[PDB]
Every structure is written in C-alpha cells, then in structure tokens.
Enzyme design. Structure first.
Site, PDB file in Angstrom:
ATOM      1  NE  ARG A   1      46.650  50.213  23.770  1.00 25.01           N
ATOM      2  CZ  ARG A   1      47.364  50.519  24.404  1.00 25.01           C
ATOM      3  NH1 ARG A   1      48.374  50.912  25.220  1.00 25.01           N
ATOM      4  NH2 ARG A   1      47.497  51.922  23.046  1.00 25.01           N
TER       5      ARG A   1
ATOM      6  NE  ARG B   1      54.771  60.418  24.298  1.00 29.17           N
ATOM      7  CZ  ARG B   1      53.889  59.046  23.859  1.00 29.17           C
ATOM      8  NH1 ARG B   1      53.775  58.171  22.897  1.00 29.17           N
ATOM      9  NH2 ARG B   1      52.922  59.169  24.426  1.00 29.17           N
ATOM     10  NE  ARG B   2      59.908  52.401  27.735  1.00 25.79           N
ATOM     11  CZ  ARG B   2      61.150  51.906  28.326  1.00 25.79           C
ATOM     12  NH1 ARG B   2      60.938  52.733  29.665  1.00 25.79           N
ATOM     13  NH2 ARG B   2      62.160  51.412  28.097  1.00 25.79           N
TER      14      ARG B   2
ATOM     15  CG  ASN C   1      58.238  24.657  29.258  1.00 27.33           C
ATOM     16  OD1 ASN C   1      58.337  25.410  27.989  1.00 27.33           O
ATOM     17  ND2 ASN C   1      58.782  24.627  29.708  1.00 27.33           N
TER      18      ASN C   1
ATOM     19  N   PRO D   1      52.561  29.154  18.311  1.00 25.87           N
ATOM     20  CG  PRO D   1      50.680  28.115  18.890  1.00 25.87           C
ATOM     21  CD  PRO D   1      51.335  29.706  18.089  1.00 25.87           C
TER      22      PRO D   1
ATOM     23  CB  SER E   1      66.054  25.140  22.567  1.00 26.85           C
ATOM     24  OG  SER E   1      65.702  24.739  21.284  1.00 26.85           O
TER      25      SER E   1
ATOM     26  CD  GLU F   1      63.274  35.111  29.580  1.00 25.81           C
ATOM     27  OE1 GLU F   1      63.446  34.313  30.319  1.00 25.81           O
ATOM     28  OE2 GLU F   1      63.150  36.415  30.029  1.00 25.81           O
TER      29      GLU F   1
ATOM     30  CB  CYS G   1      63.589  27.089  31.210  1.00 19.08           C
ATOM     31  SG  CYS G   1      62.422  28.265  32.672  1.00 19.08           S
ATOM     32  CG  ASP G   2      61.559  27.673  36.163  1.00 17.84           C
ATOM     33  OD1 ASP G   2      61.536  26.643  35.701  1.00 17.84           O
ATOM     34  OD2 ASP G   2      61.121  28.838  36.715  1.00 17.84           O
TER      35      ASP G   2
ATOM     36  CD  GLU H   1      66.568  23.027  29.663  1.00 19.16           C
ATOM     37  OE1 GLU H   1      66.827  23.306  27.558  1.00 19.16           O
ATOM     38  OE2 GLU H   1      66.602  23.571  30.193  1.00 19.16           O
TER      39      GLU H   1
END
Ligand SMILES: NC(=O)c1ccc[n+]([C@@H]2O[C@H](COP(=O)([O-])OP(=O)(O)OC[C@H]3O[C@@H](n4cnc5c(N)ncnc54)[C@H](OP(=O)(O)O)[C@@H]3O)[C@@H](O)[C@H]2O)c1
Ligand code: NA
Ligand code: NA
Ligand code: NA
Ligand code: NA
Lengths: 499, 499, 499, 499
Positions: A77, A152-153, A166, A190, A242, A261, A295-296, A393
């Site tokens: 990977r 374990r994961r 953006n 997307p 958003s 986010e 966003c920031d 915003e």
C-alpha cells in the site's frame, strides 16, 4: 491528455471526464458542465453514474474492494502511495493548471496544493505512529484474573470520502491516503463544481497500482450522493464541507463512523505584547488567501486597545496593496470566488455590517461577477454580534475588526460565533496564552501564526458547529478503523499461579 | 426509604419516583407506571418532566453543569465516584432487591450487577491510562520546521446517556462514570421500563458530592427522549439499545459524537479440539443467563462434526436441568422475561425454526405470560439462514445449534447474521484460532469462554448492525472527549538553529 | 575503489583502510592486519588512531558533532539515511563480496545482510512511532493543581556504538541509524577482526550527507576502546558482543545509558503437536546458519518423547546433507568459522559432551583450521546440564538434542542455561504455548519459527547473562535518548477555577 | 512501640532496630549507632546482617521472593500498598517525630514527607498508565509478512533500592512501590545515617500483607552494600545519592538495569519580565528548605540586570528573617544539617567564594556544630565559575547570586556546572522560555516555580553528572521492568491471503 489520455473523451470540443466505477472508467448518467470562475466558461463535462452503476460500484467495493485493499499488505500500500506521489509530482504543472482554471486558484496556491498532495502521499509511513494495538494484562481485577486482552485496529471496509470545492485535490488525496493506508476501499464524491483534480488524482493512484476494484470516483451532484451515504455497505463517511450539508449527511447515513470537518471561519486575537509586524502580516494573509475560501480563513480580528490602532492600520494597508484579477498572472494576489453567488453574499454581508454601525477599512468594491477586493470591516463590540459577518461564515475574503478592553472580552467575542474550528492568538505572555488556550472553544489554536491545516501534520477538526472528530497524520486512524478485542481465557489452566 | 427517603413520595399506596432536574428532584409531566415482570403488578410510578422542565434542565446542564463538572478537579471527581461506590455498596441488598423486582433478575445476577456498578466506580482511576495528551515535535517536515504541537483531550460538555432495560443499574453508572471522570455533565435517560435503579444510583452520586447542576435523570418514555438527543447543547450521545432505536437516535441527533452499542446476539464456535466440558458449561450459561436478555448472549452454536453430538448433548442436558420461576428464590436459575411480548416473539421464533426444518433439543415450553424454558433448537446448515432465530435477535433464552464441516463453514455461518457484537471460539489450535480471529467480523472475540462484557475491563462494541465505537475502561474516553490542538510557531525566533 | 576511492591507500600490495576522525579519514596509530577466515591470508590493513587522535575525535564529536546532528532537522536526517541506503544498494555486490571475504559469510547470507542494512536505513521513518512526548494534566492530585507537565525526548549526545564480528555491516548501520535519527553524534568501534564493512558503510553515510563532524569510525583493538567507553563525553554505549566484554564495558564506563545485547545461544522446544517438517527445517537452519555464528543460533533442542525420534532424525539428515567449504561457491551451505580457535573450542566442547554421555548424531568432523561440519549432539537429560555445550555458548554450528517427558521439563532445561536471549517453541496448543511464553526467561520467544532478529522489526534483547535493554525499530529510542520534563506553574494565575 | 512493638529490642536503654531478612526481623552483624543531628546524641542502634545473612536473604529473595511478588496478582498488590498507606497515615505523628529526630527535619517538612509517602502508596494505580504492552502487526515489511508481534513488560526480579539520608522515608517507599507494583521483590538498603524511617515503612508494608519473603531491609554501612549490588541475583539497582557513590555502584554492579538519581544542585533563572514577588519567595524557599539538603535545592541564582537588584534584595531579606535551631519548635524555619562535616564544608565553601571576589548578602554565620544560617553569596560572572559553590554541590543552605546581561549568558552559566538535574525559570515571554527549555541541559525545568520533585507526579532525573533514567509515576516502569517479545509465525498457514 498524458495522464488521462485514454480516459478523457473529447466530445463536441469540450473534454468529457467519466466517473471511475471500481474497475472501469465510464458512466451512463446525465452529463454535467464544469465551469471556470475565471470566465464563467465551460471547460469540461463529467459523466455522472446511473443509479444502476452506483449500485454496481458499491457492490464491487463491498464484495471485492474491501478484500483487495485489506489483502494488499501494508508494505505494498505504501509503495502504491509513494508511486502515486511520483506520478503527481512529475505532472505538477498539469495538476496546477487545472486547479488554477477549475478552482480559480492563484498559481502559487495551486502549486502549493499539488505539493501538499504529493507530501501527504509520501508521508503515509508517519500514519503508522497510531496503528499498533494494545496488550491488556488481566490481573488488575479479580474477575479478569488468568484472563488477557489484545486490542487491534481493523479497517472498517468502504469509506465514503466527500470533498469540498476549495481544496479539490488535497482533500481527496488526504482522505484516500488515510482511508487506504489502514486497509479500506474508498468511494470518492468530489464537489460537482471542480471534480477534475480528483479524476486526475484517482488516475495517478490507479496507474500506481491502487487495487482497481477498491476505489471509485463518482461525479454525483449534491443530493445524488445521499444514495451512497445512506447505504449499509458504506461503513464510514469522511466529510469536509458546510455545517448544513454535514447535518443532512448524518441524518441520511444514520449509525456509521463519521469525521465531520464543517469549517466556519476563525477568530484571531492580538494581545498588547504581540509582535504587530508578524501579526499584521499573518492576519492579512489569513483573511485573503484563496480569496477567503479557506475553512481556516480569519473572519474576525480582536485586538486589545493599546495595539488595535496600529494593528488594524497595518492589516488595512496590506489588504489594499493586493492585486486582484485572473489567477494565471503570477502577479495576481487574489483570483475570483467560485461563483457570482458567493460574491453577492459577501456584498450583502458588508452592507449589513455597515447598516449596523460597521465601517469599511479596506476593500469593499466588487470588481466583477466573481471578483471582489479583500475587505476589512471595523465594528464596535456592542454591535458586532448581530452582524451577518459575525453570526455566519461568509465564504469570501472578508473579516471584521473589533477593539476589545482585555483578553476576557477577546475570548468572549471569539467564542460568540456558532463555530469552533481554529483560533489564532498573537502575544507573548505565557499566562494569558495558557488562559486563551483553555477557554477558546475550538479544535485547534495557533499561537503566533495564522491558522493553517497544511497536510495535517498536526490534527485539526471542529467543535460546536464546526463538526466532530479529527483529521491529521496518525489521528485519522480513528475515523476509518474499528477496534477488535480478543479476550483469552486461561482460568485454571495453569499458566498463572493465582495472579 | 433511606437512600431515597425525602425523594420518593408515597402517593396512593404506590411509591412515586421523581426525575432529577439538575438541581432538584421533581417533575410536572405525566406520571408513568412501572411494573414487575415477576407478577405484572405496578410497583411504583415515575414522574416524567414537562417540556419546560426538559428545556430548563438542559439549560442548567449547558450553562452551569459543564463548568461544575469541568471545574471540579479530577482528584475530587475521583473522590466523588469512590464515595458513591461506598454508598451503593452499603445499600447492596436494597439495590439488588429492586433489580430482582423491577427487572426480574435472579438474585445472584442482581447482586452481580450491583457489584459491577460498585467496581466500575472504584476503578475510575484506571480510566486515566488514556487521558494524557501528545507532544508533537515539528522538524519532521520542512513546512513545520521551528513549529511544535500539543494535543490534549477536553470534555465535550453535556453527554446524553441513554440506557436499556437489561442492565438498568450498570449501564447508567458506567456511562456516568466515564462521562464524568473526563469532565462532562450528564443527562441520563433510562428505560421507562425499569428506571428505579438509575434513580437510586443518581441519588447515591448526589449524596457523594456529584455537582448537583451537572447531572440530570429524566424519566421520559421512548420518543420523548428525541427532544434531548436532537438538542445542540448535547455534544455526545452514549446509547446502548436496539439497532432500530440507535438508527433513529442518530437521525434525530445529526452531527455529534456517538457511541452506539446495538447488541444482537453472539455466535459461538466449537472446534474439534475443544474442551467440551468447558464449552458446554460456558455455552449453556451464555444461552440462558438473565433469560437470554443479554446483548452478549449466545444465539447460535456452531460445532465441527466430530464434537457436535456430544457438545449439543451436554448443552441440552444443562439447559433442561435449569429451574425457572420467580427470581426471589435463591433456588431459581431463570426468572421471567421483561414482558409477555418478549415471550410471544420467542415462541413464534421457535415455531418458525421448526416449520423450516428445525428440531427442539431442550425447552420449548412457555410456562406463563412472562415465563419460558431456555430453548435449544437444532437446525441443518442448509436451512438455518432463513430462520428468524438466525436473521434476527430474539431477546430471550433461545439459541440455534448447527453442525458444520469445518472452520470455514463455522466462520461463514457466524458472519452470516446481520450483527457483529462478539463471538466465542472454543478450541486449542493457535492457527485455527488466529484465522477465526481475523475473519469473524465482530467487535470482540472470546477465546475459550462465553462472551461477557463485565465492567468493560476489555473494550467492547459493535460491527455491522451492532453499532460503532467502544466502551471500556480507558477506551470510552474517545466517545465523551474531543481533542484540542495547540500549534506553537517559533519560525525565525532563535529557539532552533535550522531544525 | 569507487566508494572508497580516495580513502583506501594501496600500500605494499595490501589495501590500507584509515579510521574516520569526525572530519577527515586518517590515523597515525599502529597499522593492523585484517585476515580472511577463508584462507587465513591478510586482505587489508586498518590504521588505528593515536591516543591524541582519539582525544581530538571525541572533542570534535562532543563540541560540534552533538550540535551538527541535533541541529540537522529530522526531515534532513531521514533524507541522509535514505540516500545512504541508495548508495549501499547500488554497491551491493561490493558490500557483499567484502562480507564473504572478510567474514567468511556464504554469498546468500552476505547479500541478505547488505539488504538488511539497506532496509534498516530506509525504514528510519518507522522509528518515529516512539518519538512523541507526553502532555500530563495536573489536576489528578491536590499538590499539582493548576500545574501541568510536558515530557519530551532529547538525544543524549555522543553514542558509542561497539559492534561484534558476526554482523559487521548490519550492527554498525543499525546502531548508527537509531542513534542518528533522534539527533545523536556517533563513535563506531567495529571488531578489529572485520572492520572493512563499517568503513564502507560510514563512507556511504558521509557521501549521503551525514554531518562530517557528527560521526567517527575508530579501528581500535579490544581494550583500546575502553578509552572511549570511559569518557564523560560519551553519554551512551550501545554494545553487541559477549557477556564477558559487556561486563568490562560497564565497569569501565560507569554511569551512562547502556543497551547490552550479550547473546548466548537459544533453546528450541518442540511440543508433541508440532508440525515436525516445519520444526526440523527451521531448527536445522537455526543450528547452522553462518556456521552457528549468530547470537540467536539454536544451541539446544528439547523435544517431547512422542516426537523426539522423528524430529531429531530429520534434523540430523538435514545437517548431514549440508555442503561445507569456501563461501564464494553459491553452492556451499556453510563457510568457515572466524578463527581456528573457534573451531578448537567447538571440538573440545564436543569431546566434553561425549565424555559425559553424549552421542554425535550428525557432523563432528573438523575439515580444516577454520572448517567444521554442523554438529548435532544427543544427550540424556540427567547429564546435559554439566556439559560445556549447555553451560556455555560455543560460537559454532553445534547444538545439543535432549528428549524430555513434558513441557515443564522442557521449560526447566531451557531456563537452565545462564543465558536468556531468545527461545523457540514449535507446537499448536494455545495453553501450552501461553505457559511456555510466561515461564521462558528470555527477551523474546519465537512461536513456530527459528529465532531471527532480522532488522529488529520486533524488539529483541537479553535477560540473565544475555544483557539488558532492547534494540528494534522504535524501541531503541530508549537507549539513545533522555527525557526532559517541563513543569508549568499557573497556581493562582486564573487559568483554572479550582481544577 | 506499637508498629514496631515486638521488633524493636530495648537493650541498654537504647532502642535496637534489627534488619529484615526476607522472612524474619533479625541480624547477627555489628550493631551500629544512629544519632540525631539535633544534639549529636545516640537515639538508637541498628543491627547489620552478617555476610551469611546477606547471602541467605538474597537467596530467599531470588528463589522465593521473585515468585511471591510476581504471583500475587496486581489487584492484591494494590490492596497491600493501600493498606500500608492507611497504617502509615494513622501512625503519622510517630513517623514524623522520627523524621524530626533522626533527620533533623523541621516538623512541617517531616509531616510533608510522611504525607508524600502515604500519597505515593495510594496512587499506585496511576502507575498502570505505562503497564500495557504493544501488539505489532507484521505486514509493513516483506520479511515479516504473515508474522505478528506482542511486546509485554515483565518484572526483572530482585530490585536493590539504595536510598539517601535527606528523604529517608519517601525514597524507600517510592522505590518499593514502583518496584513492587510491577511484580518485583525488593532489597532496601537505607542510609546507615537515618535508617529508622525505612524500618517503620517496611513493617507497615509487612503488616499490610506485603509477601514476607519478597522484601528485605538491610542496615549495611556504605561499602558493605556493594555485596548486594554486585550480586547476579540482583537484576536492577535503583539508586538515589551522590555522583561519586553512584559511579562506584555501577562499577561494582556491572551489567544490570539502573536508575541513577545523582542530584547536584539546580540553577534558577529570573528574566526581566518575571513576577519578582513570586520569584523571590520560591527562590528563597528553594535555597533553604530542609537546610538545603535537597537534590533539587537552588544553588545558583541568575538574574537579568534590570531585576537583579530587587530580586537579590528580596531573597536576602527573606533568608535573613528565617529562624534557625532545634526542629521540634513548630516555630523554627531551619533545623540542623545532618553532620558537623556538612557545615564545615559549607563554611569553607563560603570562604572560597569570598576569597575569589564573592560577597555574602545574607547569613554566613555558623551557629553550632550542626547549625548554620541560610547563606546567599553574590559573585561576579567573571569569577563565579572557579568557585567551589559553583563547581560543586555543597549540600547545605547556600546559593550564589550572579547578575547576567541576558538569557544567553544566564543559560551559559546555568549549564556551566557539572550537574543537570533540574533548573528553574521565572519569566513570562514564551519565546525566551522556549529557548531556555531547549538549551538548559537538565532532566527537568520548572517554569515559574522552585524545583520540587514531590512524589514524582512528573518524572524527574538527571543529565550530565546528575545521573541517568527517571523516576516518576508510570515512568519508573522502565527501571524495574524488562520487555518480553513474542513473535508468532503464520507464514503460509492461511490466516492472511498475501498481507
Ligand atoms: N545479544 C545480541 O543481540 C548479540 C548479537 C550478535 C552477537 N552477539 C554475541 O557476540 C559474540 C560474538 O561477537 P564477538 O566474538 O566479536 O564478541 P566480543 O568479542 O564480545 O565483541 C566485542 C566488541 O567489543 C570490542 N571489545 C573487546 N574488548 C573490549 C574492551 N575491553 N572494551 C571495549 N570494547 C571491547 C571488540 O573489539 P575487538 O574485535 O577489537 O576485540 C568487539 O568490537 C557472541 O557471544 C554473540 O552471541 C550478541
Ligand atoms: Na443507516
Ligand atoms: Na443536530
Ligand atoms: Na564514568
Ligand atoms: Na555484574
């Protein structure tokens, strides 16, 4: 063209980008126009998949993709991601040009995003700092004596990566990278606004060896994506966008693992002992970068009385000296906003601030359907809270400036918005800084710098209306992985002698 | 009575339990009857809060509770939980009696649950193994050079703890403990079916010093709770219950942090080299404990051909020798099911298995509205998949028995149900065990023991329809805490010399 | 020659290798001959440094090297190590040839070691999984209220890497890599027996950009190195070698950080349910690889009665079919031992076993000064303990075979040697395996495989006479790093409000 | 008397304390007088063990103690430590009185130490934050594919705890606690100067259930202890004391695991923006506490020019207002130094500073054989480096004061001593603080507070001549524990499908 040679289909003079259906590029759904904010012209078309193709793609991802990704050892990977980085890097100019044209991003910013995508891919080995599991001895409780645990994961399976406009290239590559490094298959959805960079990234990944049945790229507009989110074969949803859409996504998805986010802007606080040169520079940049479509981005500046005058003076000068217009010129500082609507909203927001006692200190002039000057609006503390620019915003290059008596008032106003993504604090006193750090309700605080997520070297994410969970190198493992506990019972088997 | 002396109001011969409204016990909403499954008689009433009281409670929790909990240093929180443990411990008989009467739990099981609640409270210091934050040096990337990061956890604020009927005491105490130890305020919403134990636990906590405005106990029936879940002041929802309700909760809540323990049953696999005495004993117990009203109850037994006969023989004998009837007798092995409906469903489920080729090997006889014998239904592998007992979780003391050719078929059938909470594997060969561990899609696997979450010494949680995220000592920090990143910028400040 | 073009000085027909003095290759001390075990001929000479040059080198490492390494950001250190990997890789044949000639290593083993060195260098990013520091909140104790802690790692400064003869290339590269990745300067002191590979590795590192004043390579024989170990400018000593020398090193060094990998051999246990084909193959290989000149070589085989016959039969056959003689032939399975002394000791050890009741099952014949056949000596449990082959580590291809009644006797005999490096267990029953794992007193246990440290993907190290501390990717951070705690005091400063 | 009722033997009017020989209190070696620094009178005698008893004790600890401690499950070990805490707490006055009389410790300080010992014992559950092991997946390298690792901690066996005179109670309890919580047996060797508190602590532990054959208390003077350190049955040595003795200990011990807390004093830096009230208070206290007989005592004060005058003025006033004399008076601020020699050295050291340009700003007067006034000696930066008070640790209440131009000079002078235990920095500017933190070569830095190890809530330890490794809650696991790696091989066994 080169990377997308046999994929893109020149039809009627406009390049037509197909979706990737976990095996073959194609699509039989409606074709959709993709435009540039630089001139509102159509620069390409994307083929959306039909319901049947969405269904089939999910079926492939679930029945085969999960296993192709999981059964490719981590060592391969990593080789895949590294090779993809090389391919994107050698095609840098092409990737950048598309960002400039499709997203209206200034050349330097477009180059910066491609390089972030390349680095994110190459540093996938750093994501392993959070991959190891835990061994839990059982003798710390009487009921678990002669017992033992391993935690374990495991990958969740199929991760749906939904991305904003953006950062059309980085966000897709970021989510794909952290989702894939732990063994998941991925469906990328997307923004139908600028889906070209994702198509280019996915192809680079496929050319690099990414299991062909473990990834999909679906050009579906808005609510057509709900179909993916709501499906039981989708074990996780990584969404950047958003607040309002995020809410809809969870309500459609139901129980699943989510990383949300949800942006909103960020407030910046300047203490009386701050280096005002550094502060003015960083704050001006946080206000206008990519035309505030970050966003920031800094949306509110709070400065203690003794430095407010100079600080706001310096930021105004800097914003005024900016050069707006078409992003191709390596001369332009600010390109266009993604749509005329975004500019309309900004202008209305500025009027609202003015009608409520606000005063424009820089900018304010619309220069075209998608062009505007970075604006800095001064507002008295007693009225700013009711202004649209504060309560909301406004995704554009616009920030409010508010003078404050002291740190407590700064913190209070900073926390007054419904968001809590990041915040910035410029100053030097450790106590005032520690206080602000404790009381600012945000996922991240930037001391003496503008907020900048970069490639997520440091984890970031929201509080309040800015969402839940984090992305970042290593930390994203929490969103696309599930724990598996194995409890071994040796009660009375003679391994231990009463312990 | 003692603990609830001035709280419980004897009205019309039946004790009336009020809700706790983050400050004062009370309630002005409809009164609701609480019945015992032992005789269907009303044993008490609970006062639900009015809309106005729900609103006011949330307002108190949000505006003051978050701060009362957060501003009580961890050292005191720990003292509070320890004191509460002492109070519950000295009131053990009273806590147990209510579990026996309200939940229909056999005495020994009721005593076991109280002790689990006490231990969970006393071991809160072990939860700190996952409280520390991270210090991230910045010189591993050029863009972060002379930069540095700190990542620490913070409480989310108000956690809504929604609990099921089968562990009315432990689940409430567990969620309260892990939510409170990290600094959160908590709204508890117990099953309106047996809310008495939670009222008793909350009082013990209040007597122990738990900030009075940082906790609430609302006796709201089913969908009346949606009101809490959907509120923006509720930053997290810890829910243990059925898949269907969990789904509704997320769809009502929208974006927030969730832990969803959605049960379903567990399959148990017996390999040819297994100690059949241990296996038969543990499997029989996993099938009937608390009348199968355990999320981790065994619902399907898969045994390799060479041991299937003996194994199933032994389990049948054990289930048949059980004594059913009223749980007060320290003689009874199995008490009643929570409602006549639950028994109806079990009987119908057994008929379905029979009509599809299944054969009852033990039990099958209903003994009353809420009483039934633990049942073990044999089924041929080629037909079991379509049986209700396989496709669904029949919350009752009933499991299917299926003979299998080998491990792959065992694993295949085990993974065939829509759930993935835990699974059990009895055998000794490390390779076959490791294979089963890798391929069983569940949150936890118990080697050589029946599945038992206990107090969460080992983390547990679901996969597939069994939910997302985990509970456990330490690990629950992920559900009620958010990360806060602080990035310090020293670029060009002379701390480092190019590094 | 190529890599060492301007470094090696052809003098009197024999290549003369100088030491690297933290800046320039050189040396004014005695010249020392380096011989091949293949023909006892001198193949080169190394220039040892004078006392004055040792002193000056340490002075450079301490005054400048510590800072050159520390002030090179991690991102560049990584680039350096990766570039060095590329250089060694393209010079593979040259590196291998020298290993074959200087160490008498069979071609395939020499190629294997070079590749291990290359991989170790390339995976330096994995070492970061243990680089992050800790953030410790202070409210869990009353005395630390309003206080807070940060714990981060720092390089110690100058690490002395002392290496053995059997892995002349890997050990030097391994120690250099983990010492350098965390910011330390390094003094390498290779076995004066085969110091050529280290000189080649150091040059590759220097060519790759390794700070020139941060590394040194001193060709000092045995006790001449004490001078380095005992110096206060040396903050840590990473030593791999014999127990006896390790002891001397610590007694000379005094207080410092140490990693002592002191070898000894390893015992292998075969349970009655073991795959005897796998076991025989792996055990035979563990006995003879590199002519038993491996710290993790199998020196004792313990097999339960029911499989002892077959097992020992199969291993004997395998050892007998081996081809000894000059390592250049890709045909030879076993090359020579490093010195005639090593063979003398092996022969004497075999005689001792025989005189004490032992019987040779394979090998036993010396074929020359430095050549011998891999030997397998059977011994009765009641006499093996007093044999030299048991009580000591005979660094050669020789192991004892002992039949045992059960696991407890196997474990008892395995733990009876004075060493505790690794142990191997072949079998399938989880309980017997778990028991052996708990009771074998060694740093590492290999289940169903011969002991093999590889590149340290899994940490390894000793117990008892085998030393202290571990090496491994990530874990080695403990030996070359020190913690730095920063306690911040905000008592009464208003950051917290009683918490 | 009470706690030591049947243990202490009143012989010739003076209580005689025997050693504890891992089973029974006794001793046949020389008897040794124990005196009080308050009046130089003999207050008791301790019986040292004979060589034969030392040998037998070690034999018991090794053959049985290791197993008694290890086989007592952690849950019971914790109960033991908690019970011991209760016993010491209820005997507080008795423990304190002995500290006052035997160590000459002011009442409040004696009470403080007992409480630290009690808390250390009660917080043993916090030490578990570092007890869990690691699960390492094997697919991140081709050579480890289908392989897997588990890394867990194990006790080393017998830990020798060697303690100093200045914290006769806490150091013994601390080392015993962290050594025992992980499963080790312990040999305690207290300062023959004030061994009474350790005898009392060990008895409390024995009464609490500490396995009787797993602990020993040997009253051996100085070099008689080498016998223990050098023994192979002693797997670790935890030593707190002087640099010189530490060096001897390692040279006698050879290869073993060590924690060396070697003290020396600490420098304190005051930046121009520091709160001088806080600084003066904390610095004065760091200079005189327990008559400077603290490894973390302040021995050098460096203050930037603009605050040097006031700062040094304030500290002088504070030191002058102190009350010296017999520690029983809850009125006295400073008791006596442990021996007349210690005072002699302090006086000579003060003369040396004076002869080299130093000026006494406070104190300087000897008040008796073991009494002296806390002294503060001013020295010019250009001469301080050659003063004994700078170059050495004068274990007494004496510190130098040096005015400096800026932070770089402060840091330079602070790092100029041969020690590196802790350092203190008072100031507010984050950049200057971060710089000092990076460049001060010490195990710990205290921002805005005097250095104080407390119970080790934050790890502490030395750099340079101050030793190696750390003690602290959790972190001490590294000194008394060894890793055990278990590598499982499933190559070609069908668990994974190429991954
Ligand atoms: N535990 C592990 O992981 C591990 C791994 C590999 C090998 N080993 C062990 O190492 C041994 C084989 O290597 P070897 O024969 O070369 O053993 P060794 O003689 O003990 O190797 C010692 C290393 O230390 C140097 N040295 C010798 N005396 C010294 C002194 N007085 N002060 C400082 N340094 C000194 C040696 O240099 P000169 O060559 O000049 O003498 C050599 O570089 C076996 O016992 C093997 O099991 C252990
Ligand atoms: Na759903
Ligand atoms: Na919502
Ligand atoms: Na030394
Ligand atoms: Na020794």
């Amino acid at each position: 063209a080169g990377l997308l040679e046999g994929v893109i289909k020149e039809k009627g003079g406009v390049p037509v980008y197909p979706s990737y259906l976990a095996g073959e590029w194609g699509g039989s759904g409606q074709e959709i126009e993709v435009k540039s904010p630089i001139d509102l012209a159509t620069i390409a078309k994307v083929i959306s998949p039909s319901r049947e193709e969405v269904e089939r793609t999910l079926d492939v991802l679930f029945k085969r993709g999960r296993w192709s990704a999981r059964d490719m050892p981590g060592t391969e990977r990593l080789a895949v991601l590294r090779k993809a980085a090389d391919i994107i890097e050698r095609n840098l100019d092409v990737f950048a040009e598309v960002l400039v044209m499709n997203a209206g991003k200034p050349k330097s910013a477009a180059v910066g995003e491609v390089k972030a995508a390349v680095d994110r891919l190459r540093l996938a080995e750093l994501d392993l700092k959070k991959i190891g599991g835990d061994y839990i001895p059982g003798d710390w409780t009487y009921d678990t004596l002669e017992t033992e645990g391993l935690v374990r994961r495991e990958p969740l399976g199929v991760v749906a990566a939904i991305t904003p406009f953006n950062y059309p290239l980085f966000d897709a590559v970021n989510k794909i990278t952290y989702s894939f490094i732990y063994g998941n298959a991925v469906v990328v959805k997307p923004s139908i606004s600028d889906p070209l960079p994702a198509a280019m990234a996915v192809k680079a990944l496929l050319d690099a060896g990414f299991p062909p049945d473990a990834i999909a790229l679906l050009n579906l507009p808005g609510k057509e994506a709900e179909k993916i989110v709501a499906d039981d074969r989708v074990a996780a949803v990584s969404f950047t966008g958003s607040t309002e859409v995020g809410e809809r996504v969870v309500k459609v998805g139901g129980v699943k693992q989510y990383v949300m986010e949800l942006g909103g802007g960020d407030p910046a606080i300047v203490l009386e002992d701050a280096d005002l040169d550094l502060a003015a520079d960083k704050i001006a940049r946080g206000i206008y970068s990519y035309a505030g479509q970050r966003c920031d981005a800094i949306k509110l500046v709070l400065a203690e009385r003794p430095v407010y005058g100079k600080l706001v003076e310096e930021v105004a000068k800097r914003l005024s000296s900016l050069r707006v217009g078409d992003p191709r010129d390596p001369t332009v500082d600010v390109g266009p906003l993604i749509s005329p609507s975004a500019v309309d909203e900004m202008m209305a927001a500025i009027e609202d601030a003015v009608e409520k006692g606000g005063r424009v200190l820089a900018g304010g002039r619309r220069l075209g359907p998608t062009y505007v000057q970075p604006t800095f609006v001064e507002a008295p503390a007693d009225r700013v809270k009711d202004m649209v620019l504060y309560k909301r915003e406004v995704f554009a290059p616009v920030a409010l400036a508010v003078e404050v008596k002291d740190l407590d008032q700064a913190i209070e106003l900073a926390n007054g918005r419904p968001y809590g993504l990041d915040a910035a604090v410029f100053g030097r006193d450790v106590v005032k800084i520690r206080r602000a750090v404790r009381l600012l309700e945000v996922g991240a605080i930037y001391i003496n710098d503008m907020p900048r997520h970069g490639i997520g070297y440091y984890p970031f994410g929201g509080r309040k209306k800015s969402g839940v969970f984090r992305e970042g190198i290593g930390y994203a493992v929490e969103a696309v992985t599930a724990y598996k506990t194995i409890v071994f019972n040796y009660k009375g088997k003679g391994v231990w002698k009463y312990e």
